[PDB]
Ligand binder design. Structure first.
Ligand SMILES: Nc1ncnc2c1ncn2[C@@H]1O[C@H](C[C@@H](N)CC[C@H](N)C(=O)O)[C@@H](O)[C@H]1O
Ligand SMILES: [Cl-]
Length: 260
């Protein structure tokens, strides 16, 4: 019947504005973005700043061995490009190709000169659901829009996963795919099938806010899908009770500067 994550989602939808604001960041990990946010507002491109919070999330996965990027990196839904810029600093990465929709309401690629910027091409105006898949060594995808409806989250995740499949058939050796909604019975069954075909596992990145159940399907992970999902649901539900817990900070990403 009802999964733990579905219980989490229903309770999230019952929170007041104050409860939601306090719960959102209770006990999460975070980078302080004040220094980067000013620079990028001033139009600076050489301070080594990440363009987005996304860089810290991919760094977390890469630094803990869940993903080893190499060769040709594709970044689907690159937005401003936080994942692409981080990938460009990795020694074995040869090229980074990012694709994002852009337009009103959506994020545009940011052009900065952090280390390895010269091996990057960020392309806006691309709907990846209509782009032909091509071969690559590392496949990245950070697509999926949050919704108050778990029904919507499931459907958006399935669309992403069907699109990702065509790229995985080009047989990349590494991948990191956002799974917005892993917590429904259909989604757990879907990811068991995908795990059987392509390997990998699901990982909860602790920089994710408590207001999303997003997990990342990464090639270096092996965990049982149901256990990893249910563990994350338990964590998120427990944080809804008791007092607010402090945010834990890591230092923001410094990607350096220069060319490769
Ligand atoms: N069908 C789509 N095609 C291309 N881009 C999309 C599509 N749907 C959503 N997006 C974009 O994917 C991006 C998702 C971002 N959260 C990714 C953040 C990125 N990883 C970073 O570090 O900056 C958003 O900018 C979306 O506008
Ligand atoms: Cl998105």
């Amino acid at each position: 019947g009802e999964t733990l994550g579905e219980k989490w989602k229903a309770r999230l939808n019952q929170m007041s504005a104050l409860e939601f604001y306090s719960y959102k960041k209770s006990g999460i990990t975070e980078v302080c973005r004040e220094e980067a946010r000013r620079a990028l507002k001033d139009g600076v491109a050489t301070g080594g700043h990440a363009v987005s919070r996304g860089s810290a999330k991919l760094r977390w996965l890469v630094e803990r061995g869940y993903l080893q990027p190499y060769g040709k990196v594709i970044d689907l839904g690159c937005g401003r490009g936080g994942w692409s810029y981080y990938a460009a600093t990795i020694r074995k990465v040869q090229e980074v190709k990012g694709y994002t929709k852009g337009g009103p309401g959506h994020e545009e690629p940011m052009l900065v000169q952090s280390y390895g910027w010269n091996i990057v091409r960020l392309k806006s105006g691309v709907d990846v659901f209509h782009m032909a898949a091509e071969p690559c060594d590392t496949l990245l995808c950070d697509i999926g829009e949050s919704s108050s409806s778990p029904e919507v989250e499931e459907a958006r995740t399935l669309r992403v996963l069907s699109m990702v499949g065509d790229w995985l058939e080009k047989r990349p050796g590494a991948f990191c795919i956002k799974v917005l909604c892993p917590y429904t019975s259909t989604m757990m069954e879907t990811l068991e099938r995908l795990q059987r075909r392509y390997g990998g596992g699901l990982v909860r990145v602790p920089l994710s806010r408590n207001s999303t159940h997003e997990m990342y399907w990464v090639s270096g992970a092996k965990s049982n899908t149901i256990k990893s999902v249910s563990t994350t649901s338990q964590l998120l539900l427990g944080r809804m009770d008791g007092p607010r817990r402090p945010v834990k900070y890591e230092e923001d990403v410094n990607l350096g500067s220069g060319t490769r």
